[PDB]
Amino acid sequence: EQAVPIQPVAGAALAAPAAGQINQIDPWIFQNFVQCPLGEFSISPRNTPGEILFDLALGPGLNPYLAHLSAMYTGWVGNMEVQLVLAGNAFTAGKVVVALVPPYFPKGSLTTAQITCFPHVMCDVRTLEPIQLPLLDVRRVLWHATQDQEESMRLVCMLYTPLRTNSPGDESFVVSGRLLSKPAADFNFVYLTPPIERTIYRMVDLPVIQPRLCTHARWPAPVYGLLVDPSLPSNPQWQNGRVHVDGTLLGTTPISGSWVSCFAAEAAYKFQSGTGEVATFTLIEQDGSAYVPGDRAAPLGYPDFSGQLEIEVQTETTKTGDKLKVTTFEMILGPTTNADQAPYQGRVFASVTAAASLDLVDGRVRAVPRSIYGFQDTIPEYNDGLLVPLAPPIGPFLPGEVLLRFRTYMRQIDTADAAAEAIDCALPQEFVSWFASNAFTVQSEALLLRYRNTLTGQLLFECKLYNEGYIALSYSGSGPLTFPTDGIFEVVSWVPRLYQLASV
Amino acid sequence: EASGQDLVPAAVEQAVPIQPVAGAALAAPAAGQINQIDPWIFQNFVQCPLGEFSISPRNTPGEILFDLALGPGLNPYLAHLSAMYTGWVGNMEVQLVLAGNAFTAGKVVVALVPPYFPKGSLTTAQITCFPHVMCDVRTLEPIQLPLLDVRRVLWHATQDQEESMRLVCMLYTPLRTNSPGDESFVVSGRLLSKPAADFNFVYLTPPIERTIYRMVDLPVIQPRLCTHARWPAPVYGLLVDPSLPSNPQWQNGRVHVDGTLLGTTPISGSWVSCFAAEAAYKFQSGTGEVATFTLIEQDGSAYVPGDRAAPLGYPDFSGQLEIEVQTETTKTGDKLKVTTFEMILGPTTNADQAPYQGRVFASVTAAASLDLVDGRVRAVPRSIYGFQDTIPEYNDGLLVPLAPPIGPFLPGEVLLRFRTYMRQIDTADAAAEAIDCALPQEFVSWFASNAFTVQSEALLLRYRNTLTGQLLFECKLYNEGYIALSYSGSGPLTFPTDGIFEVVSWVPRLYQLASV
Amino acid sequence: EQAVPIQPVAGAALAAPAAGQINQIDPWIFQNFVQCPLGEFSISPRNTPGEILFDLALGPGLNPYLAHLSAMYTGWVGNMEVQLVLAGNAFTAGKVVVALVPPYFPKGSLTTAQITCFPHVMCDVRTLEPIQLPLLDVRRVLWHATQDQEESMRLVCMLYTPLRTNSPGDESFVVSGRLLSKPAADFNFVYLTPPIERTIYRMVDLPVIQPRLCTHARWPAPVYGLLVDPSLPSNPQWQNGRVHVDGTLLGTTPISGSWVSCFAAEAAYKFQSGTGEVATFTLIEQDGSAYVPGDRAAPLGYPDFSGQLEIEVQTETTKTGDKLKVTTFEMILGPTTNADQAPYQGRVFASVTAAASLDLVDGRVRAVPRSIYGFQDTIPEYNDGLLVPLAPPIGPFLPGEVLLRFRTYMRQIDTADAAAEAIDCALPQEFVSWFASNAFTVQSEALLLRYRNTLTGQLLFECKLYNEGYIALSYSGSGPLTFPTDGIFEVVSWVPRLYQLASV
């Protein structure tokens, strides 16, 4: 079992002379195995020998009585002790090798002859009892610090020889394994410190608000139902409602919910003998800060849907009696083969259809949208006709996963179309202003969300939140399925991006 | 010993990290009475009320299999002694019999969750942080494990109030089979339990009748003799059928297990599919006699619009039905007489048919004026013309609060219908159509007048044909007053009507039944 | 010092037999006094003998290495040990009495003869060293539970005999005292438990977003600067942006930022020979749920400012060619002595000025505001002319405190007024949807917020957040002072509502 060629490794006896205190641990933790939820795997007869089933590093993050207990202390030092349970019956065969890679090693792919040159154990897939093995602490600094993800001895588990079993017509016999881990005898924490809450060990908890009240992210109107639709484009590149879980703001996403689909600018009204009173807005961020052409395709809040929309603008008219007045304008977003709408440069041309020379006055303006016309869920012309640095399309989903929608409805002028087709975003704004206001640290690749009804308590599905800012949902239907809009999202854990959900 | 040992025989109580806990030695000086429980209960294990569970390959990881809380409701004895005494203490020992076929895999974890822990999710990440035990679903022997009593007051009361050390397990890594043909072995479990060294009750009170641990008693009468709850007619055969709509919302014969009525279920067997009303007879030169019935409860009490969508016992189907009425007409020489009226349910393009508001209508094709004086009367049906087993217009066409549809079923579970036939007046064919309830009227009048206490989610039933003495099927009974049965065929399947539904044990929703 | 008539009190030796585990504590906590920040006070020559200077209960909340350490355990049991430091020099005089009130006692006022009938110490205001005294645990249940604020032995400190000192012209010599408290020898925690984060010990942390980006709460437009104004009404009763710190939603506040100032309804358009096309909206909550006259003065999101405003409505016109179209309407909010605007009942009458009988069609509508006219920061007519259950006015501020504003600007039609006067709210919506999405537990009366610049780091002021949902700021100026709008709010601690800030 635990017979690997490694000398014993000292901790909390090598970093005591140079650490103020040496704090201890509630001794009922040294007697209880706990699982780090990225320590699960499932071999299957169709897995080529060489895959990496679990690869996890030593730390206080492997044991949620330590990921939490490490908010009061400055540094940790010492060993751990792990064990692996393989759930196979006596009609299977095929080995599995666990290797203790040292803490300075070019990460990447280890072919099945490079995982065994390490110190390692080999164990079959017919072992009842757990395969205990130690996780020593090979370091070079005396004691690590808790707010600093620095390198430490890692475990890597590789499928050494493929699984060979029978299997019924359902569902093909995965051999599932799990890993558990408890502090060794001399894992001590170092310096006591007032407990700061935003330490980097925090499951990303989502706001407890029903998706029926949250403010939408692409059109200023509340959410009116969430659904899945495998028929619609499965890889859109909307430019709003785009926030990574770790805080960053992809695209043109604004931190408010009121900046959406509306821009501020310096207006330039002038009369023409044709359409009448045209306007050439020089853009600006709504809060007032000047605008410069940067990496995002437009000022924060510009729309990301092609089609004609009217804007509502206050115009300090210099007529007699009609001093201040809110009037509607007319702006075209799509390419349309003739339009100098260059937001990337900071120039948007919006006109009207008026015959009089009504003498407006220039000045600061913020233009709220009034109604779309000929809506098209595709990119407007952010440049004249050139390219522009924009956010990459949402994705990529595993085979058998579809994007989750958050559908709102919008005003729409038409003549014969009566059904109010309208837009949808990836996350409601109450999630954007929540992931950018916490700066959660991101553990691996995707959270295992769960949409529970608030009163009945029964689940509805298990959506997987990809930290690149979207929510994939396992699905196989043909038509758009609609879900209730009065539940609550709640997290469960992190999970490897190769995770397979429960079909709905 | 068995043959052989390609299984894994965990016979040892695994070491749980939790100190011993004092039982009835902290309640001896504060319960002014000596008490002991028969020393032959401490000797043999015995199945709990909630005893059974199933680990089917469809159960994902994280589905709580059996979440049973320490208390007197964990033996058939300790739950039948605990109707005399008022309060308990002390530990307990629970077995766990899961001995799946030698061609299975997958592991479960049992975690002694302490008191005062928020019930609810308990996901698979925080089931190992408690003092737990991991055991394989192939284990041969029974796996003993303790259930201590962590508390802050001396002795709990024997009303469900208190909070005690639950013992919840969780399908840790899923059950997957290995045999080379078209079958996955659902491993069935059992749960035996006995009071520990110093379990004990405290104060001796009268064995009240409507106590809290009455298991359940279903009435021992054949479905052949019971009465239907949607038409005044006997039951003529029970059956399962996937062809018919498997999620109806019948507003009759709909009672919870603990007696709470739902919708418009009467308590009589005669109040069914009928109504009392203040009549208003008039005549006009078209069809003839017209009766504007103002609804009223069948017993005489006045009707009021409430949450239920009609007066108690109003018919909840759609179609034309005839009606018998005892009327006292003014015509000399023939004063008292029973006559037949006609009433059409559902949309009619002339519909002030508001059984919810309290007004319905009837029309008799009378030539002259049937001089009938208005008067309170009940109206029992006699025949249906255009039968449609759907909700009629309880308002004119508007929305009305009513009972939720019968559900939800597991994948592969069909509603078990108690079926009767009603008199039919039609013209073409001669096959009297069929209506069907979920529980015969005796079951409703029984649950409504007993008020049991439902334990977890469902009662696993059976069906013992008393003539020969063999079982017929293993049907599960949800708490919402419907009997789901596992079934896979396409055409209907009818059962004999001599069986005696007998409760077997409590059971969660996820219990995968035995297919038929 | 610590010579009071109380028997010793057992803990963790009386609740061990009936507690699964008995967990211990990092033994470097038993050797370090810590302060519970509601344990500060300042006697002053103008304090009548009898005031209660500090009144604090035993618990794990008195020692932030326990308020945090009590998220992993189920129950605590045992003693504590407190000490009080009085900072007076040898020219003062006047006693102070500390009393150990037992844990079942009608709270209220204790006159200075009822605070000494308890067990108590008396100590002068000329004592150098700390006045140590024990905080035993008089209970009746074996061990308390950590998620349950139950009663326990309290300390009460009363000014027994007034202070008598000289004092210069500035600033009148307050004798300040502080309290510190550490676990006794046998304060043990009971049952280990996965650490749930939302335990009831959590300083209410405010979103880290500059007030220049947050969405306003009374008019759908971003915040354009925050200021103090002692001249404006100092006790307004706005009906939006009103959320208690402990989660509840006072008034008509909506949980979105898009529901603001806009209502949804079932429209009833009909033509008249006068104004033309009038409309009688029967209100509804925007998400779709039906509306019933309740305790709040209007459906969630209705405006709370008197004056005429136009609304923008999509109207499925049954003409030929013009099927769908967004048109402007006209609605009056103020009393105006003739208006059947009864939101409380669910009926709002909005008209237009059109001569044609344009044949609209009824249906669901949501009415976004377009422009105000004759704005008045006073209540509209929520009933016909009667009263209505509404939120109480903001307050009450201590003498020398003024309400903080969050000023936004709004569209406005006029003829001669050019300066765009506009509305302000008490908290931006990113705070409302943040205090209602956490349900923080509230400790005493007010948080000590602090508005720090994000880069320079230097403070700007110390605003005090009253949990009734507002932010008071100590001020003495005459005119409206304006603050920078690019800082960050950050909490410091709880604080007694009698706290005196730093004047700005």
PDB file of C-alpha atoms in Angstrom, chain B residues 66-258:
ATOM      1  CA  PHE B  66     -32.930   6.576   3.991  1.00  0.00           C
ATOM      2  CA  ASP B  67     -32.949   9.579   6.334  1.00  0.00           C
ATOM      3  CA  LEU B  68     -34.284   8.256   9.622  1.00  0.00           C
ATOM      4  CA  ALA B  69     -34.253  10.265  12.843  1.00  0.00           C
ATOM      5  CA  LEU B  70     -33.604   8.793  16.269  1.00  0.00           C
ATOM      6  CA  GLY B  71     -36.796   8.288  18.221  1.00  0.00           C
ATOM      7  CA  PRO B  72     -39.365   5.694  19.227  1.00  0.00           C
ATOM      8  CA  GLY B  73     -40.481   5.453  15.623  1.00  0.00           C
ATOM      9  CA  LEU B  74     -37.685   3.048  14.748  1.00  0.00           C
ATOM     10  CA  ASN B  75     -39.161  -0.233  16.016  1.00  0.00           C
ATOM     11  CA  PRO B  76     -42.619  -1.699  15.808  1.00  0.00           C
ATOM     12  CA  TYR B  77     -42.385  -2.080  19.588  1.00  0.00           C
ATOM     13  CA  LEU B  78     -40.815   1.212  20.645  1.00  0.00           C
ATOM     14  CA  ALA B  79     -43.395   2.946  18.455  1.00  0.00           C
ATOM     15  CA  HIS B  80     -46.229   0.992  20.048  1.00  0.00           C
ATOM     16  CA  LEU B  81     -45.036   1.421  23.610  1.00  0.00           C
ATOM     17  CA  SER B  82     -44.600   5.124  22.983  1.00  0.00           C
ATOM     18  CA  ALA B  83     -48.322   5.633  22.946  1.00  0.00           C
ATOM     19  CA  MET B  84     -48.482   5.181  26.723  1.00  0.00           C
ATOM     20  CA  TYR B  85     -45.451   7.075  27.978  1.00  0.00           C
ATOM     21  CA  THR B  86     -44.667  10.771  27.417  1.00  0.00           C
ATOM     22  CA  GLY B  87     -41.022  11.075  26.480  1.00  0.00           C
ATOM     23  CA  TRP B  88     -37.889   9.040  25.860  1.00  0.00           C
ATOM     24  CA  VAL B  89     -34.104   9.135  26.135  1.00  0.00           C
ATOM     25  CA  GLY B  90     -31.118   7.144  25.155  1.00  0.00           C
ATOM     26  CA  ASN B  91     -29.253   5.510  22.325  1.00  0.00           C
ATOM     27  CA  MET B  92     -30.163   2.931  19.672  1.00  0.00           C
ATOM     28  CA  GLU B  93     -28.500   0.359  17.413  1.00  0.00           C
ATOM     29  CA  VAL B  94     -29.424   0.198  13.735  1.00  0.00           C
ATOM     30  CA  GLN B  95     -28.562  -2.577  11.312  1.00  0.00           C
ATOM     31  CA  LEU B  96     -28.378  -2.154   7.563  1.00  0.00           C
ATOM     32  CA  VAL B  97     -28.930  -5.133   5.280  1.00  0.00           C
ATOM     33  CA  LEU B  98     -27.727  -4.463   1.734  1.00  0.00           C
ATOM     34  CA  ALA B  99     -26.436  -7.666   0.174  1.00  0.00           C
ATOM     35  CA  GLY B 100     -26.676  -7.038  -3.567  1.00  0.00           C
ATOM     36  CA  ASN B 101     -25.893  -9.636  -6.203  1.00  0.00           C
ATOM     37  CA  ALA B 102     -22.246 -10.513  -6.671  1.00  0.00           C
ATOM     38  CA  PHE B 103     -22.287  -8.687  -9.993  1.00  0.00           C
ATOM     39  CA  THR B 104     -22.718  -5.111  -8.730  1.00  0.00           C
ATOM     40  CA  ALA B 105     -20.590  -2.202  -7.552  1.00  0.00           C
ATOM     41  CA  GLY B 106     -20.841   1.220  -6.045  1.00  0.00           C
ATOM     42  CA  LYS B 107     -20.643   2.435  -2.481  1.00  0.00           C
ATOM     43  CA  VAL B 108     -22.841   4.235   0.045  1.00  0.00           C
ATOM     44  CA  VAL B 109     -21.887   6.462   2.978  1.00  0.00           C
ATOM     45  CA  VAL B 110     -23.774   6.766   6.279  1.00  0.00           C
ATOM     46  CA  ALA B 111     -23.312   9.934   8.315  1.00  0.00           C
ATOM     47  CA  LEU B 112     -24.464  10.549  11.876  1.00  0.00           C
ATOM     48  CA  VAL B 113     -25.647  14.135  11.253  1.00  0.00           C
ATOM     49  CA  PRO B 114     -26.045  15.932  14.605  1.00  0.00           C
ATOM     50  CA  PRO B 115     -29.108  17.867  15.802  1.00  0.00           C
ATOM     51  CA  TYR B 116     -29.876  21.465  14.825  1.00  0.00           C
ATOM     52  CA  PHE B 117     -28.547  20.988  11.323  1.00  0.00           C
ATOM     53  CA  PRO B 118     -30.625  22.718   8.635  1.00  0.00           C
ATOM     54  CA  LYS B 119     -32.607  20.030   6.862  1.00  0.00           C
ATOM     55  CA  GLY B 120     -32.683  20.174   3.097  1.00  0.00           C
ATOM     56  CA  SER B 121     -29.907  19.826   0.551  1.00  0.00           C
ATOM     57  CA  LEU B 122     -27.071  17.935   2.274  1.00  0.00           C
ATOM     58  CA  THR B 123     -25.132  17.496  -0.942  1.00  0.00           C
ATOM     59  CA  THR B 124     -22.463  14.873  -1.576  1.00  0.00           C
ATOM     60  CA  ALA B 125     -19.680  17.248  -0.558  1.00  0.00           C
ATOM     61  CA  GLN B 126     -20.829  17.702   3.045  1.00  0.00           C
ATOM     62  CA  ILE B 127     -21.892  14.162   3.853  1.00  0.00           C
ATOM     63  CA  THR B 128     -18.343  13.029   4.583  1.00  0.00           C
ATOM     64  CA  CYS B 129     -17.459  15.897   6.919  1.00  0.00           C
ATOM     65  CA  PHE B 130     -19.796  14.357   9.511  1.00  0.00           C
ATOM     66  CA  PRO B 131     -18.638  11.252  11.390  1.00  0.00           C
ATOM     67  CA  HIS B 132     -19.406   8.738   8.682  1.00  0.00           C
ATOM     68  CA  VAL B 133     -18.937   5.166   7.481  1.00  0.00           C
ATOM     69  CA  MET B 134     -18.457   3.937   3.922  1.00  0.00           C
ATOM     70  CA  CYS B 135     -19.828   0.543   2.948  1.00  0.00           C
ATOM     71  CA  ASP B 136     -20.042  -1.344  -0.342  1.00  0.00           C
ATOM     72  CA  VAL B 137     -23.371  -2.352  -1.853  1.00  0.00           C
ATOM     73  CA  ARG B 138     -22.108  -5.914  -2.013  1.00  0.00           C
ATOM     74  CA  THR B 139     -21.617  -6.356   1.734  1.00  0.00           C
ATOM     75  CA  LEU B 140     -22.844  -9.774   2.806  1.00  0.00           C
ATOM     76  CA  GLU B 141     -23.507  -9.608   6.539  1.00  0.00           C
ATOM     77  CA  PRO B 142     -25.539  -6.900   8.248  1.00  0.00           C
ATOM     78  CA  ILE B 143     -23.582  -3.754   9.029  1.00  0.00           C
ATOM     79  CA  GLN B 144     -24.302  -2.648  12.588  1.00  0.00           C
ATOM     80  CA  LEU B 145     -23.916   1.008  13.411  1.00  0.00           C
ATOM     81  CA  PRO B 146     -24.948   3.090  16.411  1.00  0.00           C
ATOM     82  CA  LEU B 147     -27.368   5.964  16.685  1.00  0.00           C
ATOM     83  CA  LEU B 148     -26.436   7.929  19.784  1.00  0.00           C
ATOM     84  CA  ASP B 149     -28.575  10.675  21.296  1.00  0.00           C
ATOM     85  CA  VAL B 150     -26.936  14.102  21.258  1.00  0.00           C
ATOM     86  CA  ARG B 151     -29.153  16.558  23.084  1.00  0.00           C
ATOM     87  CA  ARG B 152     -29.140  19.523  25.396  1.00  0.00           C
ATOM     88  CA  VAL B 153     -32.275  18.771  27.425  1.00  0.00           C
ATOM     89  CA  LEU B 154     -32.575  15.806  29.758  1.00  0.00           C
ATOM     90  CA  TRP B 155     -35.345  13.761  28.101  1.00  0.00           C
ATOM     91  CA  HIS B 156     -37.146  14.617  24.897  1.00  0.00           C
ATOM     92  CA  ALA B 157     -40.915  14.759  24.711  1.00  0.00           C
ATOM     93  CA  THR B 158     -42.709  12.071  22.748  1.00  0.00           C
ATOM     94  CA  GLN B 159     -44.353  14.533  20.387  1.00  0.00           C
ATOM     95  CA  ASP B 160     -42.504  14.922  17.093  1.00  0.00           C
ATOM     96  CA  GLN B 161     -41.302  18.338  18.291  1.00  0.00           C
ATOM     97  CA  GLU B 162     -37.771  17.573  19.373  1.00  0.00           C
ATOM     98  CA  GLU B 163     -34.668  17.341  17.205  1.00  0.00           C
ATOM     99  CA  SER B 164     -32.437  14.300  17.511  1.00  0.00           C
ATOM    100  CA  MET B 165     -29.426  12.787  15.829  1.00  0.00           C
ATOM    101  CA  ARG B 166     -30.602  11.806  12.365  1.00  0.00           C
ATOM    102  CA  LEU B 167     -28.744   9.027  10.534  1.00  0.00           C
ATOM    103  CA  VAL B 168     -28.767   9.754   6.809  1.00  0.00           C
ATOM    104  CA  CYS B 169     -26.963   7.822   4.096  1.00  0.00           C
ATOM    105  CA  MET B 170     -26.254   8.781   0.526  1.00  0.00           C
ATOM    106  CA  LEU B 171     -25.612   6.908  -2.681  1.00  0.00           C
ATOM    107  CA  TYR B 172     -21.959   7.883  -2.767  1.00  0.00           C
ATOM    108  CA  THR B 173     -20.809   6.270  -6.012  1.00  0.00           C
ATOM    109  CA  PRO B 174     -23.507   4.872  -8.264  1.00  0.00           C
ATOM    110  CA  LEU B 175     -24.596   1.272  -8.496  1.00  0.00           C
ATOM    111  CA  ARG B 176     -23.550  -0.248 -11.800  1.00  0.00           C
ATOM    112  CA  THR B 177     -23.936  -3.873 -12.776  1.00  0.00           C
ATOM    113  CA  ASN B 178     -21.660  -6.279 -14.575  1.00  0.00           C
ATOM    114  CA  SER B 179     -23.635  -9.321 -15.756  1.00  0.00           C
ATOM    115  CA  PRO B 180     -23.535  -9.905 -19.516  1.00  0.00           C
ATOM    116  CA  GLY B 181     -27.247  -9.676 -20.227  1.00  0.00           C
ATOM    117  CA  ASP B 182     -30.088  -7.164 -20.268  1.00  0.00           C
ATOM    118  CA  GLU B 183     -30.489  -6.792 -16.506  1.00  0.00           C
ATOM    119  CA  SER B 184     -29.276  -4.493 -13.738  1.00  0.00           C
ATOM    120  CA  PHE B 185     -29.724  -5.886 -10.239  1.00  0.00           C
ATOM    121  CA  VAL B 186     -31.658  -3.387  -8.160  1.00  0.00           C
ATOM    122  CA  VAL B 187     -30.321  -4.033  -4.673  1.00  0.00           C
ATOM    123  CA  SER B 188     -33.109  -3.911  -2.112  1.00  0.00           C
ATOM    124  CA  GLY B 189     -32.247  -2.915   1.426  1.00  0.00           C
ATOM    125  CA  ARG B 190     -33.685  -3.577   4.836  1.00  0.00           C
ATOM    126  CA  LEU B 191     -33.339  -1.812   8.165  1.00  0.00           C
ATOM    127  CA  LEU B 192     -33.491  -3.570  11.513  1.00  0.00           C
ATOM    128  CA  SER B 193     -33.134  -1.736  14.805  1.00  0.00           C
ATOM    129  CA  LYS B 194     -33.186  -2.328  18.542  1.00  0.00           C
ATOM    130  CA  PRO B 195     -33.025  -0.043  21.573  1.00  0.00           C
ATOM    131  CA  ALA B 196     -29.585   0.318  23.030  1.00  0.00           C
ATOM    132  CA  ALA B 197     -28.354  -0.524  26.507  1.00  0.00           C
ATOM    133  CA  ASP B 198     -30.266   2.267  28.243  1.00  0.00           C
ATOM    134  CA  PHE B 199     -33.143   3.419  26.130  1.00  0.00           C
ATOM    135  CA  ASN B 200     -36.073   4.147  28.372  1.00  0.00           C
ATOM    136  CA  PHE B 201     -39.388   5.935  28.565  1.00  0.00           C
ATOM    137  CA  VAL B 202     -40.176   8.321  31.377  1.00  0.00           C
ATOM    138  CA  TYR B 203     -43.716   9.154  32.515  1.00  0.00           C
ATOM    139  CA  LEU B 204     -46.719   6.871  32.107  1.00  0.00           C
ATOM    140  CA  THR B 205     -49.771   8.518  30.543  1.00  0.00           C
ATOM    141  CA  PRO B 206     -53.029   7.151  29.115  1.00  0.00           C
ATOM    142  CA  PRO B 207     -52.668   5.403  25.763  1.00  0.00           C
ATOM    143  CA  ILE B 208     -54.556   8.058  23.856  1.00  0.00           C
ATOM    144  CA  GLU B 209     -56.476   6.891  20.807  1.00  0.00           C
ATOM    145  CA  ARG B 210     -55.437   9.349  18.089  1.00  0.00           C
ATOM    146  CA  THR B 211     -51.758   9.054  18.963  1.00  0.00           C
ATOM    147  CA  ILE B 212     -48.897   9.989  16.660  1.00  0.00           C
ATOM    148  CA  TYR B 213     -47.370   6.602  15.753  1.00  0.00           C
ATOM    149  CA  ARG B 214     -50.398   4.785  14.371  1.00  0.00           C
ATOM    150  CA  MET B 215     -48.807   3.071  11.410  1.00  0.00           C
ATOM    151  CA  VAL B 216     -51.729   2.886   8.921  1.00  0.00           C
ATOM    152  CA  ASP B 217     -54.766   0.595   8.640  1.00  0.00           C
ATOM    153  CA  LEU B 218     -56.298   0.204   5.261  1.00  0.00           C
ATOM    154  CA  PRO B 219     -59.880  -1.099   5.450  1.00  0.00           C
ATOM    155  CA  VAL B 220     -60.101  -4.860   4.948  1.00  0.00           C
ATOM    156  CA  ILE B 221     -62.811  -4.925   2.285  1.00  0.00           C
ATOM    157  CA  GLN B 222     -62.501  -6.112  -1.293  1.00  0.00           C
ATOM    158  CA  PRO B 223     -62.425  -3.515  -4.095  1.00  0.00           C
ATOM    159  CA  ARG B 224     -65.324  -5.516  -5.531  1.00  0.00           C
ATOM    160  CA  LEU B 225     -67.581  -4.335  -2.683  1.00  0.00           C
ATOM    161  CA  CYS B 226     -66.316  -0.764  -2.205  1.00  0.00           C
ATOM    162  CA  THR B 227     -68.134   2.231  -3.688  1.00  0.00           C
ATOM    163  CA  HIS B 228     -66.797   4.447  -6.452  1.00  0.00           C
ATOM    164  CA  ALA B 229     -66.113   8.103  -5.693  1.00  0.00           C
ATOM    165  CA  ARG B 230     -67.181   9.619  -9.025  1.00  0.00           C
ATOM    166  CA  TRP B 231     -70.541   7.939  -9.727  1.00  0.00           C
ATOM    167  CA  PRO B 232     -73.137   6.369  -7.417  1.00  0.00           C
ATOM    168  CA  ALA B 233     -72.237   2.830  -8.471  1.00  0.00           C
ATOM    169  CA  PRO B 234     -70.106  -0.036  -7.121  1.00  0.00           C
ATOM    170  CA  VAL B 235     -66.547  -0.704  -8.199  1.00  0.00           C
ATOM    171  CA  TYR B 236     -66.362  -3.254 -11.009  1.00  0.00           C
ATOM    172  CA  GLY B 237     -62.631  -3.895 -11.409  1.00  0.00           C
ATOM    173  CA  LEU B 238     -59.278  -2.186 -10.922  1.00  0.00           C
ATOM    174  CA  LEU B 239     -56.667  -1.931 -13.636  1.00  0.00           C
ATOM    175  CA  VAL B 240     -53.626  -0.091 -14.951  1.00  0.00           C
ATOM    176  CA  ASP B 241     -53.571   1.615 -18.326  1.00  0.00           C
ATOM    177  CA  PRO B 242     -50.905   3.846 -19.894  1.00  0.00           C
ATOM    178  CA  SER B 243     -53.067   4.692 -22.894  1.00  0.00           C
ATOM    179  CA  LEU B 244     -55.417   6.999 -20.993  1.00  0.00           C
ATOM    180  CA  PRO B 245     -54.117  10.380 -19.763  1.00  0.00           C
ATOM    181  CA  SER B 246     -51.739   9.614 -16.905  1.00  0.00           C
ATOM    182  CA  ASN B 247     -52.071  13.026 -15.202  1.00  0.00           C
ATOM    183  CA  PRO B 248     -55.717  13.946 -14.633  1.00  0.00           C
ATOM    184  CA  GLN B 249     -57.060  16.298 -11.981  1.00  0.00           C
ATOM    185  CA  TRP B 250     -60.320  14.662 -10.948  1.00  0.00           C
ATOM    186  CA  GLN B 251     -62.028  16.765  -8.285  1.00  0.00           C
ATOM    187  CA  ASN B 252     -63.665  13.736  -6.638  1.00  0.00           C
ATOM    188  CA  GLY B 253     -62.179  10.871  -4.679  1.00  0.00           C
ATOM    189  CA  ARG B 254     -59.116  12.961  -3.819  1.00  0.00           C
ATOM    190  CA  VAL B 255     -57.995  12.754  -0.188  1.00  0.00           C
ATOM    191  CA  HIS B 256     -54.531  12.910   1.317  1.00  0.00           C
ATOM    192  CA  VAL B 257     -53.304  10.012   3.419  1.00  0.00           C
ATOM    193  CA  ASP B 258     -53.790  11.998   6.637  1.00  0.00           C
TER     194      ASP B 258
END
